[PDB]
Amino acid sequence: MKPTIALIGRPNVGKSTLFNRLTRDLPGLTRDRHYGHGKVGSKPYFVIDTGGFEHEMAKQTLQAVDEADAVVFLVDGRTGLTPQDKIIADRLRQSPRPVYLAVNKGEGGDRAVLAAEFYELALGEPHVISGAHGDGVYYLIEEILENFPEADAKHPVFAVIGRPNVGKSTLVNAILGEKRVIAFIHIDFEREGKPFTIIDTFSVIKAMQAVEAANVAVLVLDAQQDIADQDATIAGFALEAGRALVVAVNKWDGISEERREQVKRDISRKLYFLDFAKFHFISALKERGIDGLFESIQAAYNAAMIKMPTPKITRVLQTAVGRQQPPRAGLVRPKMRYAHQGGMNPPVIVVHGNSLHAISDSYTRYLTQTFRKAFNLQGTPLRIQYNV
Amino acid sequence: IMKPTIALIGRPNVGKSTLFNRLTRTKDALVHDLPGLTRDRHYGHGKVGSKPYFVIDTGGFEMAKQTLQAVDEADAVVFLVDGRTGLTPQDKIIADRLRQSPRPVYLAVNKGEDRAVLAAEFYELALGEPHVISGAHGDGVYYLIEEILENFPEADAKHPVFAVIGRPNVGKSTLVNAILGEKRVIASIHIDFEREGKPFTIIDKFSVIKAMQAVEAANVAVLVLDAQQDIADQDATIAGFALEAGRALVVAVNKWDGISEERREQVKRDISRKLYFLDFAKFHFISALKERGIDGLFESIQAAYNAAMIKMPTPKITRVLQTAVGRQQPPVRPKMRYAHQGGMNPPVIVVHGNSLHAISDSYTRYLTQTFRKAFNLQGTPLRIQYNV
Ligand SMILES: Nc1nc2c(ncn2[C@@H]2O[C@H](COP(=O)(O)OP(=O)(O)O)[C@@H](O)[C@H]2O)c(=O)[nH]1
Ligand SMILES: Nc1nc2c(ncn2[C@@H]2O[C@H](COP(=O)(O)OP(=O)(O)O)[C@@H](O)[C@H]2O)c(=O)[nH]1
Ligand SMILES: Nc1nc2c(ncn2[C@@H]2O[C@H](COP(=O)(O)OP(=O)(O)O)[C@@H](O)[C@H]2O)c(=O)[nH]1
Ligand SMILES: [Cl-]
Ligand SMILES: [Cl-]
Ligand SMILES: [Cl-]
């Protein structure tokens, strides 16, 4: 498992600003993220901005301290020292895990004088940084990662994920039965002869790690409630991980028929960014729909692991381009000539040609759907990329 | 009578969006937003203060062409600087351009939660009195706003007064000439005309401030979209402003002459998916250039105005409500007994009962549609509200 860094600090000290630096959809909207994959640094890691949970600290914030591999305590170096900061430092100092004191917004400053007050916190060396502009952030992260040192399974290895109370335990018990669940990290089992592995592990950190360890994620939704922010950030994390995905709309036994289309329409409207995944309507309690859930889990694994021959891809591309030409880039007419796979799990298709530098999102969506149909890629977040 | 516009100006990271959110904060928070997403706003209606006004956070442009325009066209500028940091060379160049302004320019020394020391450093900018504030916590903000507004001193038209709004280059000028030159149309900021006996007024490069002023002067807005491009962020924020104004709306999907038949459904799909929050308005698919489809615009403008101005008797509303609830009960089981109109242009329906504190967004959607069908309210952003 790769490390998780939890950002902690007073409101307005620069946490989300830092988080966006470390981890850097429809028009007019911006997707809320308070946890994601660290992209700044030589090693992979997860980042949690505990500002997204919230004076004393918050229940989930203290949990993040217990569960993260390290905490960054962010403070406003321009201000001076607020008494709220001294309280937080008192709890963090007890951490048996790393606590890095980051003195933020110290850009163009004197890094020694700006960390003068903060030795009193007894959390060690203050790290003068600037989350906005990046001064010292890369070097801070590299020291955090100097602690932790840095092949696809032949069958689907899946994690059941989702909000509390959607039915994950009921689904797992329905899948495994009593006898194989009493032998619980990885539980290998067989179904109709074919092999599967389920991963057993609210804890954001625990959910990210389930996603990291799996090659398929089964996202469980409670059909009896509206889709929630937390439903959406979990699914969003899975999407950023490129994890193959199957969606289990659970507690379907509760919905009357009149309400059924209203709920299917509601769910596709609010989880549009999952239209690459098959949606099953199941009842973990009454054990209905589980068989087709397994068909889709296997299909998601297959799609995720596909190896597509360049001539097939190029053939599919040229037929699509012949039927509908790409949008004219103002005056210039893009030419799409060939394409090949540049990644796996998820598959990535790289399109080659001239003037591919401003291809509209809708045309990229048309190529994606064509490729998905041609290669049966439902279940994996296939991505198109233009060689520019 | 035009309302004043205040433009926030300043370096990245001085507190503009924070201030803008404070100044435009709606207690009820009425935006039809999705789970996990947040709708971006950098201009809106001012809510802090005794008088009405608009606010623009010029940070949403990234000096810059549009920012310089806001300096020219706003009634006043707030120049936001970081009092904690000190005085950056970038701040001084901005002061050099702002100092030439023939309109009010207020120097706000932010993040002060030391007022005397922070006013001496900033007198070097020669922008007058520094105002020490804290946009995050609110220190001094209210007094700043009242001092800006102490300059500007503080009936529905019987027929539709409509404004054509939308992004640069979508066809607004072509559409206006087409409307005034149509077959059945007979002909200092308002242009009065008539069609088939009924009266109309249309309101007469691109300016965010001018778009906001068009909406406030109107009782109906015609939003023009360029069908030949993907819906853009700027398409959505213009529509979003119209929505926050509660402005009755007709949507003109323009340049339909360019779209081939195959591409046409892929485009209607794309538009309804990305402008979901406009599902209350009729969409027309027109060609302003070839002057096709303009005739049907006039009925929808009339229909939207009529809907916006409706007066619904309490017994009819309660009747429709009790019937809707009888056919589909709410999902402890809330009881909805009666309802009345508590607002106009847009109409607002207030529902009274027990256990109404957690009604799902999806049920409120069922009631909104039910009321919309029953009272012919397409074109006005009708909203349901619960008394707790
Ligand atoms: N009607 C219905 N209720 C269910 C179903 N699955 C779970 N529940 C109920 O949801 C509650 C929580 O289920 P649980 O498996 O613990 O959810 P978890 O938090 O995701 O593990 C329990 O009281 C279940 O009986 C289902 O398929 N249908
Ligand atoms: N000067 C400076 N300003 C910053 C920095 N990071 C964030 N800000 C500004 O701080 C304001 C709010 O900070 P935010 O990131 O939301 O703090 P959070 O509440 O901890 O997430 C924004 O207007 C930011 O642009 C920094 O490193 N330097
Ligand atoms: N093909 C096509 N082009 C149009 C149409 N309406 C406007 N245009 C073109 O769009 C460009 C800008 O139009 P204009 O009315 O100035 O857009 P505005 O910025 O919204 O006022 C011009 O070159 C027009 O010829 C239409 O219905 N079809
Ligand atoms: Cl991962
Ligand atoms: Cl293949
Ligand atoms: Cl205030």
Coordinates of N, CA and C in Angstrom, one line a residue, chain B residues 6-116:
Chain B
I6 N -19.9 46.8 -8.5 CA -18.6 46.9 -7.8 C -17.7 45.8 -8.4
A7 N -16.5 46.1 -8.8 CA -15.5 45.2 -9.4 C -14.4 45.0 -8.4
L8 N -14.2 43.7 -8.0 CA -13.0 43.4 -7.1 C -11.8 43.2 -8.0
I9 N -10.6 43.7 -7.6 CA -9.4 43.7 -8.4 C -8.3 43.3 -7.4
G10 N -7.4 42.5 -7.9 CA -6.2 42.2 -7.1 C -5.4 40.9 -7.5
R11 N -4.2 40.8 -7.0 CA -3.3 39.7 -7.3 C -4.0 38.4 -7.0
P12 N -3.6 37.3 -7.6 CA -4.1 36.0 -7.1 C -3.8 35.8 -5.7
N13 N -4.7 35.2 -4.9 CA -4.5 34.8 -3.5 C -4.6 36.0 -2.6
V14 N -5.3 37.1 -2.9 CA -5.4 38.1 -1.9 C -6.8 38.1 -1.2
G15 N -7.7 37.3 -1.7 CA -9.0 37.0 -1.0 C -10.2 37.4 -1.8
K16 N -10.0 37.5 -3.1 CA -11.2 38.0 -4.0 C -12.3 37.0 -3.9
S17 N -12.2 35.7 -4.3 CA -13.3 34.8 -4.2 C -13.9 34.7 -2.9
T18 N -13.1 34.7 -1.8 CA -13.6 34.7 -0.5 C -14.5 35.9 -0.2
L19 N -14.0 37.1 -0.6 CA -14.8 38.3 -0.4 C -16.1 38.2 -1.3
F20 N -16.0 37.8 -2.5 CA -17.1 37.7 -3.4 C -18.2 36.8 -2.9
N21 N -17.8 35.7 -2.3 CA -18.7 34.8 -1.7 C -19.4 35.4 -0.5
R22 N -18.7 36.1 0.3 CA -19.3 36.8 1.4 C -20.3 37.9 0.9
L23 N -19.9 38.6 -0.1 CA -20.8 39.8 -0.5 C -22.0 39.3 -1.2
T24 N -22.0 38.1 -1.9 CA -23.1 37.6 -2.6 C -23.8 36.4 -2.0
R25 N -23.5 36.2 -0.7 CA -24.0 35.0 0.0 C -25.5 35.0 0.2
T26 N -26.2 33.9 -0.4 CA -27.6 33.7 -0.2 C -27.8 32.7 0.9
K27 N -28.6 33.1 1.9 CA -28.8 32.2 3.1 C -29.5 30.9 2.6
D28 N -30.4 30.9 1.7 CA -31.1 29.7 1.3 C -30.2 28.9 0.3
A29 N -29.3 29.6 -0.4 CA -28.4 28.9 -1.4 C -29.2 28.2 -2.5
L30 N -29.8 29.0 -3.4 CA -30.7 28.4 -4.4 C -30.0 28.4 -5.8
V31 N -29.3 27.2 -6.0 CA -28.7 26.8 -7.3 C -29.0 25.4 -7.5
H32 N -29.4 25.0 -8.7 CA -29.8 23.6 -8.9 C -28.7 22.6 -9.1
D33 N -27.7 22.6 -8.2 CA -26.4 22.0 -8.4 C -26.5 20.5 -8.1
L34 N -25.6 19.8 -8.6 CA -25.5 18.3 -8.6 C -24.6 17.8 -7.5
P35 N -24.6 16.5 -7.1 CA -23.8 16.0 -6.0 C -22.3 16.0 -6.4
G36 N -21.4 16.5 -5.5 CA -20.0 16.5 -5.7 C -19.5 17.7 -6.5
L37 N -20.4 18.4 -7.1 CA -20.0 19.5 -7.9 C -20.4 20.8 -7.3
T38 N -19.7 21.9 -7.6 CA -20.0 23.3 -7.2 C -20.1 24.2 -8.4
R39 N -21.1 25.0 -8.5 CA -21.2 25.8 -9.7 C -20.4 27.1 -9.5
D40 N -19.5 27.3 -10.4 CA -18.6 28.5 -10.4 C -19.4 29.8 -10.6
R41 N -19.1 30.8 -9.8 CA -19.7 32.1 -9.9 C -18.6 33.2 -9.7
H42 N -18.4 34.1 -10.7 CA -17.6 35.2 -10.4 C -18.3 36.5 -10.6
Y43 N -19.6 36.5 -10.9 CA -20.4 37.7 -10.8 C -21.8 37.4 -10.4
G44 N -22.4 38.3 -9.6 CA -23.7 38.0 -9.1 C -24.3 39.2 -8.4
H45 N -25.4 39.0 -7.7 CA -26.1 40.1 -7.0 C -25.5 40.3 -5.6
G46 N -25.2 41.5 -5.3 CA -24.7 41.8 -3.9 C -25.8 41.6 -2.9
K47 N -25.5 41.0 -1.8 CA -26.4 40.7 -0.7 C -26.1 41.4 0.6
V48 N -24.8 41.8 0.8 CA -24.5 42.5 2.0 C -24.6 44.0 1.8
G49 N -25.4 44.7 2.6 CA -25.6 46.1 2.4 C -27.1 46.5 2.3
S50 N -27.3 47.8 2.4 CA -28.7 48.3 2.4 C -29.3 48.5 1.0
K51 N -28.4 48.7 0.0 CA -28.8 48.9 -1.3 C -28.5 47.7 -2.2
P52 N -29.2 47.5 -3.3 CA -28.8 46.5 -4.3 C -27.6 46.9 -5.1
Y53 N -26.9 45.9 -5.6 CA -25.7 46.1 -6.5 C -25.2 44.8 -7.0
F54 N -24.4 44.8 -8.1 CA -23.7 43.7 -8.6 C -22.3 43.7 -8.2
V55 N -21.7 42.5 -8.1 CA -20.3 42.3 -7.8 C -19.7 41.4 -8.9
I56 N -18.5 41.8 -9.3 CA -17.7 41.0 -10.2 C -16.4 40.7 -9.6
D57 N -16.0 39.4 -9.4 CA -14.7 39.0 -9.0 C -13.9 38.9 -10.3
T58 N -13.0 39.8 -10.6 CA -12.3 39.8 -11.8 C -11.3 38.6 -11.8
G59 N -11.1 38.0 -10.7 CA -10.2 36.8 -10.6 C -10.7 35.7 -11.6
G60 N -12.0 35.7 -11.9 CA -12.6 34.7 -12.8 C -12.3 34.9 -14.3
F61 N -11.5 35.9 -14.6 CA -11.0 36.1 -16.0 C -9.7 35.4 -16.3
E62 N -8.8 35.3 -15.4 CA -7.4 34.9 -15.7 C -7.3 33.5 -16.3
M63 N -2.4 43.2 -16.6 CA -3.6 42.7 -16.1 C -4.2 41.8 -17.2
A64 N -5.5 42.0 -17.5 CA -6.2 41.2 -18.5 C -7.3 42.1 -19.2
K65 N -7.6 41.7 -20.5 CA -8.5 42.5 -21.2 C -9.9 42.7 -20.5
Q66 N -10.5 41.6 -20.1 CA -11.8 41.7 -19.4 C -11.7 42.4 -18.0
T67 N -10.5 42.3 -17.4 CA -10.4 43.0 -16.1 C -10.3 44.5 -16.3
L68 N -9.6 44.9 -17.4 CA -9.5 46.3 -17.7 C -10.8 46.9 -18.1
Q69 N -11.6 46.1 -18.8 CA -13.0 46.6 -19.1 C -13.8 46.8 -17.8
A70 N -13.7 45.9 -16.9 CA -14.4 46.0 -15.6 C -14.0 47.3 -14.9
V71 N -12.7 47.6 -15.0 CA -12.3 48.9 -14.4 C -12.9 50.1 -15.1
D72 N -13.1 50.0 -16.4 CA -13.8 51.1 -17.2 C -15.2 51.2 -16.9
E73 N -15.9 50.0 -16.8 CA -17.4 50.0 -16.8 C -18.0 49.9 -15.4
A74 N -17.4 49.4 -14.4 CA -17.9 49.4 -13.1 C -18.1 50.8 -12.5
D75 N -19.1 50.9 -11.6 CA -19.3 52.1 -10.9 C -18.3 52.4 -9.9
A76 N -17.6 51.3 -9.4 CA -16.6 51.5 -8.4 C -15.7 50.2 -8.5
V77 N -14.5 50.3 -8.0 CA -13.5 49.2 -8.0 C -13.1 49.0 -6.5
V78 N -13.0 47.8 -6.1 CA -12.3 47.5 -4.8 C -11.0 46.9 -5.2
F79 N -9.9 47.5 -4.7 CA -8.6 47.0 -5.0 C -8.1 46.2 -3.8
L80 N -8.1 44.9 -3.8 CA -7.8 44.0 -2.7 C -6.3 43.7 -2.6
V81 N -5.7 43.9 -1.5 CA -4.3 43.6 -1.3 C -4.1 42.9 0.0
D82 N -3.0 42.2 0.1 CA -2.7 41.3 1.3 C -2.0 42.1 2.3
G83 N -2.7 42.5 3.4 CA -2.0 43.2 4.4 C -1.0 42.4 5.2
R84 N -1.2 41.1 5.3 CA -0.2 40.3 6.0 C 1.1 40.2 5.3
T85 N 1.1 40.1 4.0 CA 2.3 39.9 3.2 C 3.2 41.1 3.3
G86 N 2.7 42.3 3.1 CA 3.5 43.4 2.7 C 3.1 43.9 1.4
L87 N 4.0 44.7 0.7 CA 3.6 45.4 -0.5 C 4.5 44.8 -1.6
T88 N 3.8 44.1 -2.6 CA 4.5 43.4 -3.7 C 4.6 44.3 -4.8
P89 N 5.7 44.1 -5.7 CA 5.8 45.0 -6.9 C 4.6 44.9 -7.8
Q90 N 4.0 43.7 -7.9 CA 2.8 43.5 -8.8 C 1.7 44.5 -8.3
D91 N 1.5 44.5 -7.0 CA 0.4 45.4 -6.4 C 0.7 46.9 -6.9
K92 N 1.9 47.3 -7.0 CA 2.2 48.7 -7.3 C 1.9 49.0 -8.8
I93 N 2.1 48.0 -9.7 CA 1.8 48.3 -11.1 C 0.3 48.4 -11.2
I94 N -0.5 47.5 -10.5 CA -2.0 47.6 -10.5 C -2.4 49.0 -10.0
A95 N -1.8 49.4 -8.9 CA -2.1 50.7 -8.4 C -1.9 51.8 -9.4
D96 N -0.8 51.7 -10.3 CA -0.5 52.7 -11.3 C -1.6 52.8 -12.3
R97 N -2.2 51.6 -12.7 CA -3.3 51.7 -13.7 C -4.6 52.2 -13.0
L98 N -4.9 51.7 -11.8 CA -6.1 52.1 -11.1 C -6.1 53.6 -10.7
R99 N -4.9 54.2 -10.4 CA -4.8 55.6 -10.0 C -5.4 56.5 -11.1
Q100 N -5.3 56.1 -12.3 CA -5.8 56.9 -13.4 C -7.4 56.9 -13.5
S101 N -8.0 56.0 -12.8 CA -9.5 55.8 -12.9 C -10.2 57.1 -12.6
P102 N -11.1 57.5 -13.5 CA -12.0 58.6 -13.1 C -13.2 58.2 -12.2
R103 N -13.3 56.9 -11.8 CA -14.3 56.4 -11.0 C -13.7 56.0 -9.6
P104 N -14.6 55.8 -8.6 CA -14.1 55.4 -7.3 C -13.2 54.2 -7.3
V105 N -12.1 54.2 -6.6 CA -11.2 53.1 -6.4 C -10.9 53.0 -4.9
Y106 N -11.4 51.9 -4.2 CA -11.2 51.7 -2.8 C -10.1 50.7 -2.6
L107 N -9.1 51.1 -1.8 CA -8.0 50.2 -1.4 C -8.4 49.4 -0.2
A108 N -8.5 48.1 -0.3 CA -8.9 47.3 0.8 C -7.7 46.4 1.2
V109 N -7.2 46.7 2.4 CA -6.1 45.9 3.0 C -6.7 44.8 3.8
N110 N -6.6 43.6 3.2 CA -7.4 42.4 3.6 C -6.6 41.6 4.6
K111 N -7.4 40.6 5.2 CA -6.8 39.6 6.1 C -6.3 40.2 7.4
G112 N -7.0 41.3 7.9 CA -6.7 41.9 9.1 C -7.6 41.5 10.3
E113 N -7.4 40.3 10.9 CA -8.3 39.9 12.0 C -7.6 39.8 13.4
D114 N -4.1 45.5 14.0 CA -2.9 46.1 13.3 C -3.3 47.2 12.2
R115 N -4.5 47.8 12.4 CA -5.0 48.6 11.3 C -4.1 49.8 11.0
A116 N -3.5 50.4 12.0 CA -2.7 51.6 11.8 C -1.4 51.3 11.0

